[PDB]
Amino acid sequence: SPALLARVNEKKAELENLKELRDLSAAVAAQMEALEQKLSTLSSGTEAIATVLANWHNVLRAISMASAKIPPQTLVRIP
Amino acid sequence: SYFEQQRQALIEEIAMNFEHVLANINKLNRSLEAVIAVGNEFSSVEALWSQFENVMSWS
Numbered sequence A: 001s002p003a004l005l006a007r008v009n010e011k012k013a014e015l016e017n018l019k020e021l022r023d024l025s026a027a028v029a030a031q032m033e034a035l036e037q038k039l040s041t042l043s044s045g046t047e048a049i050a051t052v053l054a055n056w057h058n059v060l061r062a063i064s065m066a067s068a069k070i071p072p073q074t075l076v077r078i079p
Numbered sequence B: 001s002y003f004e005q006q007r008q009a010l011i012e013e014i015a016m017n018f019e020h021v022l023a024n025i026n027k028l029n030r031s032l033e034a035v036i037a038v039g040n041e042f043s044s045v046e047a048l049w050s051q052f053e054n055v056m057s058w059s
Helices: A002-067 B002-039 B043-056
Strands: none
Touching: A002 B043
């Protein structure tokens, strides 16, 4: 009986530890959600610079087509 | 030899204007050489954008 009183005290300490672990795991997952948001923002910035490469790539090809002229209308696209 | 005397005086006049022009071109030629000497900064620069136009017909 008194030994079992000490046993339940051990279990009390264990439960306190477990509660802290549970709280920490919840906080961990919360941080993962926040992390995912920031990573999405990063990818957005990368997409922006991909747009920049699209600009210069079209520039280069447009010039090369004019530069490679070795033997029209004005219809273009103006968003 | 009256016309020969005229020939002598006139060829000397020609020599005067001749040498005058020589001195003119000499000071000018110094200007020319100085100009190109200041302008020789176009070797690597031209080579750089030569590589630019070279890579235009590369990709």
